[PDB]
Amino acid sequence: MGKSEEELSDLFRMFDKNADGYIDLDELKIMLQATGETITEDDIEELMKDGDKNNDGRIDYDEFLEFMKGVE
Ligand SMILES: O=C(O[C@@H]1Cc2c(O)cc(O)cc2O[C@@H]1c1cc(O)c(O)c(O)c1)c1cc(O)c(O)c(O)c1
Ligand SMILES: [Ca+2]
Ligand SMILES: [Ca+2]
């Protein structure tokens, strides 16, 4: 489970299937897969824009918040 930065950190590295400290786009579409996210490929980028509004090519814990910001 992931609540505040206290657990967010662990919940973050736990989602990165590649296991490299960060999460790429090819892993995002699979990160929500465990939930059953069945959408076209044009909708995936719709989630990254929030996880990485800077579009630097990588999502870091610091940006992981802009995606969760306390959601449920
Ligand atoms: O991106 C989705 O989950 C994100 C990852 C995630 C998680 O792994 C564990 C957890 O405790 C909370 C959590 O919130 C995330 C999230 C990100 C968003 O941008 C968002 O709008 C949202 O409602 C939530 C998502 C997609 C969905 O299609 C969906 O229906 C949903 O309810 C959620
Ligand atoms: Ca990664
Ligand atoms: Ca970024």
Side-chain angles (χ1 to χ4, degrees):
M1 228 107 157
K3 264 242 166 100
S4 189
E5 300 108 70
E6 276 89 19
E7 233 158 308
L8 248 312
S9 64
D10 207 307
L11 174 95
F12 181 72
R13 77 207 305 286
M14 184 226 273
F15 276 132
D16 184 30
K17 212 98 175 201
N18 180 18
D20 62 357
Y22 299 71
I23 282 186
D24 292 286
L25 273 104
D26 194 329
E27 310 175 15
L28 290 171
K29 58 202 232 108
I30 290 172
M31 163 176 185
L32 262 287
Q33 234 192 54
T35 307
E37 62 114 29
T38 40
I39 73 193
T40 60
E41 164 183 47
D42 188 4
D43 251 337
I44 295 295
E45 274 219 289
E46 202 289 335
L47 276 128
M48 184 65 160
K49 52 102 82 180
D50 252 73
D52 263 14
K53 256 251 220 216
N54 325 301
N55 294 340
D56 315 335
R58 243 159 185 180
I59 314 188
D60 170 88
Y61 175 28
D62 231 321
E63 291 160 357
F64 196 50
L65 248 53
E66 205 96 42
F67 186 61
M68 313 303 256
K69 217 228 244 102
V71 66
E72 224 188 8

